[PDB]
Design a protein around this ligand. Structure first.
Ligand SMILES: Nc1ncnc2c1ncn2[C@@H]1O[C@H](COP(=O)(O)OP(=O)(O)OP(=O)(O)O)[C@@H](O)[C@H]1O
Ligand SMILES: Nc1ncnc2c1ncn2[C@@H]1O[C@H](COP(=O)(O)OP(=O)(O)O)[C@@H](O)[C@H]1O
Ligand SMILES: [Mg+2]
Ligand SMILES: [Mg+2]
Ligand SMILES: [Zn+2]
Ligand SMILES: [Zn+2]
Ligand SMILES: [Zn+2]
Lengths: 212, 664, 461, 426
DNA sequence: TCGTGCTGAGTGATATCTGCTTTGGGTGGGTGGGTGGGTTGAGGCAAT
DNA sequence: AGCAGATATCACTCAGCACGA
């Protein structure tokens, strides 16, 4: 019919499963951050699906130069140096959505199963993030088994966000300092989970084709 | 030859040579080619009839002083596939070009139309694909989408700056005006001349303003999975689109799926997540139109000039009223007395305001008190489908303030506010209350003021206001004990009180009696209807033709044509009484009162004389006649007298019928 | 003026691109076949004229940017060459079936179009060099044009598994079909064009990240140095992909045939230098030790053990308790003065205490490094500036193919190529530019060292 | 330059207009000055007749032209009253087509429009600045600012080294005016299909304040402007003239406003030997019979006399009427007519009413977090008639709240620390 | 090929000035949010 | 009052040459 001009490279996703051990939410520790492990819990709440910036592309305000493939951290990121020798622009950039790449993003809230809960104790809660095809695969009330990587989530606020003014434990939760970004502020951390695999534990012609 | 003025061809236009669709469309030559092709499509497109659809649409647009030209997506897709693909993929620039080419087709018909409306907007009617707010993903970004939902929240109409002009704080030079995106703010960082890091005071000698409104679209209860939380989106309504959707309604939104940077979102989530919105292109009122989803166009009750001529031709026929009555609920075998009442209620009367001091209701209320299996709920469903604005409610499912209007505290402003109800939503429409007898007393009592004064009075939390409720009420009820006792008076068969009964213009009592011939005929008709509706029993044209053939068997008038006819008659026809037999009506009223003096009989008051006049007006309206004739008055008298006679007991029914034989 | 002229230039080149031709969607056969326009040859000639009269004589590069914007290459020239090559292959198969069978019409016109397409390909793929005298327009468009060249190379090596290489080989073999005495200067020019095309394809690589130095670097600093286009990865343009494509399309055989009959059945003046440049660009970034080393698992285990030892040595510097434990140390100098240090390791050890004392110091003595951009001299990235240890990670099959090709060349024609190059260059020493000197020296050194290593490993060769 | 010419043209219009042999506006200005009424009411038809160019200039840019007209009026007043006075106010009257309140949009921005509605809320008088005396913190430089209340002004950003915003207002030497805020709703008959009534914010200055009470239909002439509370502006109306069918001044004051020609029309009518029959026939002409109920309604409208005894005891002077009857008696129509004819009246449904609806309601301010008292039908209908339809439908709880209102004509509130006794003479 | 200045402009660096904004409370708002705090009292509504 | 960004004026390194050794 016609030539499609937009054909970008595929974003492959690797999903693991069948791990030898399944952990509980209460068994999560900081020694396993950045490790591949499986957890089990009951889904409590599910957020909506949002587009997440993955590979941003920017254009220079001054000379109209183009900067592409800007990897994004937990916060919004912009270039600092123009690729144009002549141009002096450092801190003046505009995002280009046409050339940018976005990914599906969902936040899932889970809590430990009732049977695993110590008697007379409040359930423990954790945040699970789903991306790509794993989105909308867990519904509230289900008992799911997630396989993924334990991560630590900073306070993006502190780090400095465009247009965002920055800012249990009785003031004893003091963050880390000394960073350039954090001129007089401190950085706190939060344990989260990035899941790459979800398993929920708990007309004639069309039908005939399905059967063996 | 100037290269910027050269143009390509359609097959060459199909071949894309740019890095993206937007870049291909924005090129001068490609833009000129697209504009030329769109103009050709608008000017030369012909339907099955052979006349230019969009020429007539433009004529009507200019006649009504409107600024919105409706274009059917299917027509464009068949005529120009490549242009339809471009519109689907890059709605923005394609819509800009389409708007330009439309003010040159409007201006073709009305040369000086620019003095009325500066710009004309193009609205897409039937997008082939329909999405749910759950199904939206990142692949739909910057592309036309069609979603359905519930208008939970609404803002007030604000003037938004079309063009923004900036001036340097320091230098003082005033930058040229810039296009204001609907989605997010426009700012200037780098000055072309001054080259100053500092901000610009925003000032302008003359600014053009644009209507702006925002709504909170929510998944409809019907479509959301059972027991799961709904999803919502924010819809932005620009000029000419404001106030078209009212809170609590069900709508289908055609718009552009857009994303923008949100700092607080990022902050809260902890990930680089972009906020999403919908830029409304077209709105279709889906409320009470579930069974009308098989039609095309933004409004199924709207009409064209040819359809108006067809309506006139149909009306000129002598037996128009009989056909209209027969076309009411064709799948229901008989009940020609429940169909006549329903038709009269649907058409309604003419409200009157004598010298600005006396207000007279102009709507007809109907009550169906009958046996369990006499096809009352189906009649109510048909009335809901046919009426322009209809609301359906159940007995106990309706509260005293769910009907009428209710008071809440506003989440945003933390102040008491007013919300509408069933009645409000049914303004200039019909309110259907199934299981009327099962209603709570409190609930029932609510509608008393609304059913006669056509207004709702609220005095709560410092809110002193009066609303407009010009809605007709058709209700279905079951007699006390679950079955009518024809021996006892009407009053003893129902628990309703005198005022509520008097407020009902027409009473239709339905009895289920065992009779060989009646049972045989009803069973035969029901079996034939069931066989007719079996799912198994161009492609679109063939489907429409077979549907028309099936419909022709049981209805003399097409259903869609009937709905358009009813809407046209209600909107454009206001019959008046000038010649009429005063003595006949006076004697009928006196006789009705004398016969109703009996204890336990159906109440009779001046309301029923006014109802006789209203039914005469409605019968006159059914023919698109500007004046009530004697035949219509006689028919109304016959209807009312027959209802009154049927409401009586078995013992005295013969005497009553013999006495009133003169009028009927 | 300048902006309006740029707009007119872009519009005219866009019209040319749309007029060259495109796929014919009318035919039901899928994927659709490319169809030539009415004035394909005229369009190509006009494009070449634009290149000559605007890009070079006026010292600008707007024509190349306009050509890259509208995808003239990836959509018109490469499909044309591939279709012509497929037609020639079908004709050869038919001749095999029956030599008298022919399925060609307007063969001369098709060959003319193919030759013009190859010439334009060489023009667009020619190396880009920025000098001190380069105009402002040339300086400003360096990075964008380099990115477009990267895209061109990726498409050339990927599309149809790289059949345009086979098309160029066929064009060269057309010249080879006629005897050396019968070879006209045009044929030698075509051969040089093919060799230059191969050299350009091998040579292209990511450019440098140029930053203005007017202002001292901000508090933010350098984010990243990325020159790759949006949808291009290093895997597409690496020498591994080049080796794969060349092996698949039998480019190595053609080059070996040319270099084995060198100076005997060919005119060496045209062919000696292009071969030398091709081979230098082949072997400039390749370390010869890697060529003479599952084993991957064994090496991974060894590297993991090495990292484990490094981490174990690092552990002694970490405190068992958390940071806020708060141990304070006082260390006595030879004179009675006490210095303060913090950390458990300070209390438990003395060398750690002195190391921390040193480390805590704020003042730094300035270090000035004399850095020369290689792009300034026009040279490519090679062993001279590549960081020591930078290894080209070949696959087993690709490594075997590359080793076989190099071995065959060294056993066939390295002697003759070196002799011819040395004669030609010593005859014309003064005209040498820096690039030619570096090229000759590096080629000689690389091949001599590789032969030494192979002789050590294998007693035969 | 052009401003001086505009002022001269306005002065010439004031000093030269005449339709027969009376200079209407000159004499009107003199009479207004005599009684310390610094204003002037101008009929726009006269302005159009005198010179269409002046009307065109006024309509094109009202916010920039009206102040020049006020300055011209002030100059003419000084010429006519002082033998060699704050800025005078301009009040406009027009007969242009009334735009529905809901039809006000972007197209009507910064233009003179006429519309009618119902006032639902009024604010407490505030203070605006007209003449400001300022002084610089560092060098103590005295300066003055003259401010007009028409918005398209701030303290100087730079002194005349001194830091940004160096001027501080001296209050004892400044002059202020009165300002008020009103909320205008749309007429119930003009509301579109199935829509809630719409509210509009409006402002009045000086002599247009304290002119309307909540619940009274009014006609407003003003400018449809916008103010920035980022890509949007909040619409509002700048009142230039108020026209109402109820003499609010004569209702809240013992003072009575009636022209001599009126007073003598009402005396002649009273002299009629059979005025009772005329008034009885004049109520609900479209309702047959019910003569006794019509007489009762006449008596209720007229009301009795209230006496305050020396000991402090007060005797009610209002008449209440109840209609208990069968359906179809036309009681609701009589109630609607009574609500229409009485100078002050509120029509309420018993069903749709509450205890807090019909007396007064404790309401917390969202911002100040302070509790205030809003008013209900029996405070909004003070001095008038309350038509309580469907009396029987009213809950007991709701009903019981009416006794003191009916008999003692007062509302006693003891809620959220608010102890007050309101007045409800209905 | 060491020693001692004289020249020198380049490449820094660090000692040195120019503009927010804040607390919390409506003397910044509701096109910054309500999971960053405030917050007890009255009022209307549905299930009971 | 404190904090983060920026300007501009402060030195220091490698650069290279003349004399004589
Ligand atoms: N004497 C009359 N003259 C004119 N119209 C009348 C008369 N009596 C009744 N009507 C009409 O009868 C209808 C009765 O409705 P209305 O609401 O006025 O009744 P109501 O007496 O308040 O009864 P309900 O108790 O049922 O509310 C109205 O249309 C009224 O115009
Ligand atoms: N007169 C009739 N003609 C055709 N179908 C009928 C008739 N009466 C009843 N039916 C059938 O019987 C059913 C009656 O159910 P319904 O009318 O909904 O109950 P109710 O009368 O209590 O509302 C319907 O599904 C309808 O198809
Ligand atoms: Mg039913
Ligand atoms: Mg009533
Ligand atoms: Zn730049
Ligand atoms: Zn400037
Ligand atoms: Zn000063």
């Amino acid at each position: 019919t016609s030539t499609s001009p937009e054909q970008t490279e595929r974003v492959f996703q690797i999903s693991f499963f069948n791990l030898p051990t399944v952990h509980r939410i209460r068994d999560i520790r900081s020694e396993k951050i950045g490790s591949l492990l499986s957890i089990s819990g009951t889904v409590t709440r599910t957020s909506e699906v949002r587009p997440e910036l993955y590979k941003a592309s920017f254009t220079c305000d001054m000379c109209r130069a183009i900067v592409d493939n800007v990897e994004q951290s937990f916060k919004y990121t912009e270039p600092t140096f123009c690729p144009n020798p002549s141009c002096e622009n450092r801190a003046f950039w505009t995002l280009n959505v046409t050339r940018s790449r976005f990914l599906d993003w969902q936040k899932v809230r889970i809590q430990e199963n009732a049977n695993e809960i110590p008697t007379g104790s409040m359930p423990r809660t954790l945040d699970v993030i789903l991306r790509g095809d794993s989105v909308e695969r867990a519904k509230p009330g289900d008992r799911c088994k997630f396989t993924g990587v334990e991560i630590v989530v900073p306070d993006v606020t502190q780090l400095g966000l465009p247009g965002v003014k920055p800012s249990t434990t009785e003031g004893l939760n003091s963050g880390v300092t000394g960073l350039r970004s954090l001129g007089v502020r401190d950085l706190t951390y939060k344990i989260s989970f990035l899941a790459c695999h979800v398993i929920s534990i708990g007309d004639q012609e069309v039908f005939l084709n399905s059967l063996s | 030859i100037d290269p910027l003025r050269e143009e390509l061809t359609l097959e060459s236009l199909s071949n894309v040579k740019a890095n993206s669709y937007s870049e291909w469309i924005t090129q001068p030559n490609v833009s000129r080619t697209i504009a030329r092709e769109l103009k050709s499509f608008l000017l030369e497109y012909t339907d099955e009839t052979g006349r230019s659809v969009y020429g007539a649409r433009i004529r009507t647009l200019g006649e009504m002083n409107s600024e919105s030209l409706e274009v059917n997506y299917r027509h464009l897709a068949e005529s120009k596939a490549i242009l339809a693909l471009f519109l689907a993929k890059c709605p923005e620039e394609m819509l800009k070009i389409f708007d330009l080419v439309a003010m040159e087709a409007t201006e073709l018909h009305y040369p000086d139309y620019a003095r009325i409306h500066s710009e004309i907007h193009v609205r897409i009617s039937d997008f082939p694909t329909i999405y749910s707010l759950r199904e939206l993903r990142e692949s739909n970004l910057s592309s036309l989408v069609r979603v359905t939902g519930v208008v939970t929240r609404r803002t007030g109409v604000f003037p938004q700056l079309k063009y923004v002009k900036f001036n340097c704080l320091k230098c003082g030079s005033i930058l040229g005006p810039f296009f204001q995106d609907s989605n997010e703010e426009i700012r200037i960082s780098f000055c072309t001349n001054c080259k100053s890091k500092g901000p610009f005071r925003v000032n302008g000698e003359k600014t053009v303003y644009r209507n702006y409104q925002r709504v909170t679209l929510q998944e409809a209860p019907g479509t959301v999975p059972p027991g799961r939380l709904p999803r919502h989106r924010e819809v932005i309504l620009l000029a000419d689109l404001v106030d078209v959707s009212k809170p609590g309604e069900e709508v289908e939104v055609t718009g552009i799926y857009k994303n923008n940077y949100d700092g607080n979102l990022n902050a809260k989530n902890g990930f680089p997540v972009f906020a999403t919105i919908i830029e409304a292109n077209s709105i279709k009122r889906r409320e009470g139109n579930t069974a009308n989803e098989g039609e095309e166009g933004l409004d199924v009750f709207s009409w064209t000039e040819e359809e108006e001529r067809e309506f006139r031709k149909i009306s000129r026929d002598r037996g128009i009223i009989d056909k209209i009555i027969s076309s009411m609920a064709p799948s229901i075998y008989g009940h020609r007395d429940i169909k006549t009442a329903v038709a009269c209620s649907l058409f309604g009367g003419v409200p009157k305001n004598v010298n600005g001091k006396h207000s007279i209701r102009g709507d007809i209320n109907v009550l169906l008190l009958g046996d369990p299996g006499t096809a009352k709920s189906q009649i109510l469903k048909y009335v809901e489908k046919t009426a322009h604005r209809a609301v359906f409610a159940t007995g106990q499912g309706a509260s005293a303030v769910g009907l009428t209007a209710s008071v809440r505290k506003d989440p945003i402003t933390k102040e008491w506010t007013l919300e509408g109800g069933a009645l409000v939503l049914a303004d200039k429409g019909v309110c259907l209350i199934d299981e009327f007898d099962k209603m709570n007393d409190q609930d029932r009592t609510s509608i008393h003021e609304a059913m006669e004064q056509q207004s709702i009075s609220i005095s709560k939390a410092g809110i002193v206001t009066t609303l407009q409720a010009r809605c007709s009420i058709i209700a279905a009820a079951n007699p006390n004990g679950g079955r009518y006792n024809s021996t006892l008076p009407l009053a003893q068969n129902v628990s309703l009180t005198e005022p509520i009964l008097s407020r009902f213009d027409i009473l239709c009592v339905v009895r289920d009696l065992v009779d060989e011939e009646a049972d045989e005929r009803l069973a035969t008709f029901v079996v034939d209807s069931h066989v007719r509706s079996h799912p198994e029993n161009n492609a679109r044209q063939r489907r429409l033709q077979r549907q028309r053939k099936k419909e022709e068997e049981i209805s003399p008038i097409p259903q869609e044509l009937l709905m358009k006819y009813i809407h046209y008659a209600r909107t454009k026809i206001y019959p008046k009484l000038h010649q009429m037999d005063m003595d006949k009506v006076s004697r009928v009223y006196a006789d009705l009162r004398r016969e109703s003096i009996s204890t336990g009989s159906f109440p009779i008051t001046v309301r029923h004389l006014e109802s006789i006049l209203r039914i005469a007006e409605s019968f006159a309206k059914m023919r698109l006649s500007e004046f009530v004739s004697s035949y219509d008055l006689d028919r109304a008298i016959k209807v009312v007298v027959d209802s009154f006679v049927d409401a009586q007991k078995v013992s005295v029914r013969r005497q009553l019928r013999r006495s009133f034989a003169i009028y009927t | 003026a300048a902006d309006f002229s740029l707009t007119v230039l872009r519009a005219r080149i866009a019209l040319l691109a749309t007029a060259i031709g495109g796929p014919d969607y009318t035919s039901q056969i899928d994927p659709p076949p490319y169809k030539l326009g009415d004035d394909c040859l005229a369009c190509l000639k006009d494009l070449k004229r634009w290149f000559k009269l605007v890009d070079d004589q006026q010292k600008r590069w707007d024509v190349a940017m306009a050509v890259a914007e509208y995808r003239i290459l990836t959509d018109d020239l490469l499909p044309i060459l591939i279709d012509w090559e497929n037609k020639c292959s079908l004709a050869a198969k038919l001749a095999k079936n029956n030599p008298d069978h022919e399925e060609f019409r307007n063969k001369a016109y098709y060959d003319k179009i193919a030759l013009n397409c190859l010439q334009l390909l060489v023009l667009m793929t020619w190396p880009l060099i920025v000098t001190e005298q380069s105009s402002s327009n040339q300086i400003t468009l360096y990075g964008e044009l380099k990115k477009h060249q990267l895209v061109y190379k990726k498409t050339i090596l990927s599309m149809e598994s790289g059949k345009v290489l086979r098309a160029a080989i066929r064009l060269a073999l057309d010249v080879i079909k006629i005897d050396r005495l019968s070879r006209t200067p045009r044929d030698n020019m075509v051969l040089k064009l093919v060799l230059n095309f191969f050299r350009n394809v091998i040579a292209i690589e990511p450019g440098e990240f140029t930053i203005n130095t007017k202002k001292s670097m901000p508090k933010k600093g350098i984010t990243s140095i990325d020159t790759l286009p949006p949808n291009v990865s290093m895997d597409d343009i690496s020498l591994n992909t080049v080796i794969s494509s060349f092996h698949k399309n039998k480019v190595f055989g053609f080059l070996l045939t040319l270099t084995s009959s060198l100076s005997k059945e060919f005119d060496q003046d045209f062919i000696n230098i292009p071969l030398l440049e091709i081979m230098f660009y082949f072997t400039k970034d390749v370390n010869q030790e890697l060529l003479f080393p599952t084993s991957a698992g064994f090496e991974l285990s060894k590297l993991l053990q090495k990292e484990h030892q490094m981490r174990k040595n690092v552990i002694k510097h970490t405190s068992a308790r958390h940071s806020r434990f708060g141990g304070l140390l006082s260390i006595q100098t030879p004179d009675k003065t006490r210095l303060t240090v913090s950390g458990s390791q300070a209390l438990v050890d003395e060398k750690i205490a002195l190391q921390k004392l040193d480390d805590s110091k704020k003042w730094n003595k300035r270090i000035i490094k004399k850095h020369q951009s290689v792009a300034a001299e026009g040279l490519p990235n090679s062993l001279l500036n590549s960081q020591t240890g930078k290894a080209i990670f070949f696959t087993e099959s690709n490594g075997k193919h590359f080793k076989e090709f190099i071995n065959n060349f060294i056993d066939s024609g390295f002697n003759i190529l070196l002799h011819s190059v040395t004669n030609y260059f010593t005859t014309e020493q003064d005209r040498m530019v820096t690039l030619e000197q570096v090229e000759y020296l590096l080629f000689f050194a690389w091949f001599v060292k590789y032969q030494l290593l192979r002789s050590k490993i294998d007693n035969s060769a | 330059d052009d401003n001086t010419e505009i002022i001269k043209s306005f002065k010439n219009f004031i000093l030269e207009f005449r339709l027969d042999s009376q200079f209407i506006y000159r004499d009107q200005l003199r009479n207004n000055i005599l009684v310390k009424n610094y204003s002037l009411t101008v009929n726009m038809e006269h302005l159009i007749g005198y010179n269409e160019d002046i009307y065109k200039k006024l309509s094109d840019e009202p916010s920039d032209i009206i102040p020049l007209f006020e300055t011209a009026i002030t100059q003419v007043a000084k010429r006519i009253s002082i033998l060699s006075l704050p800025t005078f106010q301009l009040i406009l009257n027009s007969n242009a087509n009334q735009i529905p309140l809901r039809d006000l949009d972007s197209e009507h921005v910064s233009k003179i429009v006429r519309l009618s509605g119902i006032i639902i809320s009024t604010s407490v008088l505030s203070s605006r600045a007209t003449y400001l005396s300022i002084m610089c913190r560092n060098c103590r430089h005295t300066t003055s600012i003259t401010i007009n209340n028409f918005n398209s002004v701030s303290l100087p950003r730079s002194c005349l080294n001194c830091g940004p915003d160096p001027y501080i207002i001296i209050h004892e030497s400044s002059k202020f005016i009165d300002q008020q805020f009103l909320k205008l709703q749309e007429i119930p008959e003009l509301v579109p299909v199935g829509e809630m009534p719409r509210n509009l914010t409006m402002t009045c200055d000086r002599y247009l304040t304290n002119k309307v009470i909540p619940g009274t239909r009014v006609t407003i002439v003003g400018i449809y402007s916008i103010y920035n509370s980022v890509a949007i502006r909040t619409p509002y109306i700048k009142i230039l003239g108020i026209q109402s069918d109820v003499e609010t001044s004569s209702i809240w004051n013992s003072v009575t406003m009636f022209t001599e020609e009126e007073e003598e029309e009402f005396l002649q009518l009273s002299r009629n030997p059979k005025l009772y029959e005329i008034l009885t026939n004049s109520i609900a002409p479209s309702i047959f019979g019910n003569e006794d109920i019509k007489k009762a309604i006449v008596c209720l409208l007229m009301g009795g006399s209230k006496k305050i005894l020396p000991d402090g005891m007060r005797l009610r002077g209002d008449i209440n009427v109840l209609l208990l009857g069968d359906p179809g008696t036309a009681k609701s129509q009589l109630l609607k007519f009574v609500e229409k004819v009485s100078p002050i009246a509120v029509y309420t449904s018993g069903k749709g009413s509450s205890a807090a609806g019909l007396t007064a309601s404790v309401q917390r301010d969202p911002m100040t977090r302070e509790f205030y008292l809003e008013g209900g039908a029996m405070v909004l209908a003070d001095g008038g008639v309350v038509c309580i339809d469907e009396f029987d439908k009213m809950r007991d709880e709701d009903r019981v709240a009416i006794h003191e209102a009916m008999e003692q004509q007062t509302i006693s509130i003891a809620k959220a620390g608010i102890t007050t006794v309101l007045n409800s003479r209905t």
